[PDB]
Amino acid sequence: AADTPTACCFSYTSRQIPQNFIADYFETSSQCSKPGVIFLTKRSRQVCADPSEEWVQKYVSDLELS
Amino acid sequence: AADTPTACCFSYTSRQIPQNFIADYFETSSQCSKPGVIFLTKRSRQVCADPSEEWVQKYVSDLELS
């Protein structure tokens, strides 16, 4: 599907998520004013995170290697 | 719930949706770069629509007045 709305991030979480709550991730479209990663947790919550930060890169990396 | 991603339209459906498919609507955040209305259909398709189009204005008013 699409003309689906596209997910964009305008603020980012202050505080790092327990890595074992993390089920998945994606990168927000380049169409967004800001760049971002969206982590999907096990409860299926979606969280906006700052792609510059180490923990998000780590978590993304770990997710891609698994 | 937040820090959810916010929904933004980057383009608009170009065929008017038959009105009796419409289940609901929301307006996109003013943080998006473009205005929008996301219509939700009876089957749960989310559809981005130009709020400056006449039929969208109509559908929105009809939803609000019932």
UniProtKB/Swiss-Prot annotation, chains A, B:
Outcome after substituting residue 15 to A: Slightly reduces heparin binding
S-S bridge residues: 8-32, 9-48
Site (Involved in GAG binding): 15, 43, 45
Domain of life: Eukaryota
Effect of residue 64 to A: Reduces self-association
Protein name listed in UniProt: MIP-1-alpha(4-69)
Organism: Homo sapiens
